[PDB]
Amino acid sequence: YQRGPDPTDAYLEAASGPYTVSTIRVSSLVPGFGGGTIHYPTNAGGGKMAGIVVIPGYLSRESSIKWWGPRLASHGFVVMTIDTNTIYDQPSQRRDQIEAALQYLVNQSNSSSSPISGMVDSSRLAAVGWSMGGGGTLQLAADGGIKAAIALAPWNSSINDFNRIQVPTLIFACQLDAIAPVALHASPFYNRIPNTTPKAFFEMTGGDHWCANGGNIYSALLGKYGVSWMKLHLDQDTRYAPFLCGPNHAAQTLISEYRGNCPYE
Known part of the structure; x- marks a missing residue:
């Protein structure tokens, strides 16, 4: 499943990866979620790719998390940034909508007329979620069915099944978050995940609840x-491990705490 150039720090920190990214609008009338935008690379080499859904948020729309669409897709993924049914939906409703949106992506790849016809490997799916959508993402990770999870400043009930998560999970915490305080959300969620499950915790110095949304x-x-x-986790691409395992992450101004269970095997 490996594709593309051998990575470097500058290549990974740049605003775009190497591939040209096209988009299609998904109507707000789609069943099971609120619509969104499919982002996909046009020149990624002919092989199928993993599919990723990105979900809000805190009383917010697709626009709040849209930055993750091109950033991921330009490195060789099919990535759909979504709206939910309403801005008020709770984390378990968000979990269900992630699942419906992933199925929609599979369905479009399996069609004959979609621009993404043939492009998605339905066995390699993942989710990225901000805030209450981060809680929904962790709930889906606890149930299985995705191969990787990223939570951006997650908010969730302290009553959860996160101690079951087998899915490789990266948590971005926002140091000064007052909506989902790190001490009540991101930190205990990370600590509950089994030590046998590949995981990482990156706390962003000075960040408010929006800090992990990009841009x-x-x-x-x-x-x-x-x-x-x-x-690393969707393409099994070990060339990306040195960026996660080895560096003194907390020596950087913008990282106020790091935790992990490197190496990932």
Whole structure:
């Protein structure tokens, strides 16, 4: 499943990966979620790719998390950024909508008329979620069915099944978050995940609840670590492991705490 150039730090911190990214609008009338945008690379080599859904949020729309669409897709993934049914939906409703959106992506790849016809490997699916959508992502990770999870400043009930998660999970915490305080959300969620499950915790210095959404002072690190996580766990691409395992991450101004269980085998 490996594709593309041998990575470097500068290549991973740049605003775009090497592939040209096209988009299609998904109507708000689609069943099971609120619509969105499919992002896909046009020149990624002929092989099938993993499929990723990106979900909000805190009382917010697709636009809040859209930055993750091109950032991931330009490195060789089919990535759909979505709206939910309403901005008020709770984390378990968001979980269900991630599953419906992943199935929609599979269905479009299996069609004869979609621009993404043939492109998605339905056995390699993943989710990225902000805030209440991060809680929904962790709930889906606990149930299985995705191969990787990234949570951006997650919010969830302290009553959960996160101690069951077998899915490789990266958590971005926002140091100063007051909506989902790290001490009540991101930190205990990370600590509950089994020590046998590949995981990582990156806390962003000074960040408010929006800090992991990209398009901001943290972009270079969010994109480097997030792309490396998806490459390593969805493509089994060990060339991306040195970006996650080895560096003194907390020596950087923008990282206020790091935790992990490297190496990942």
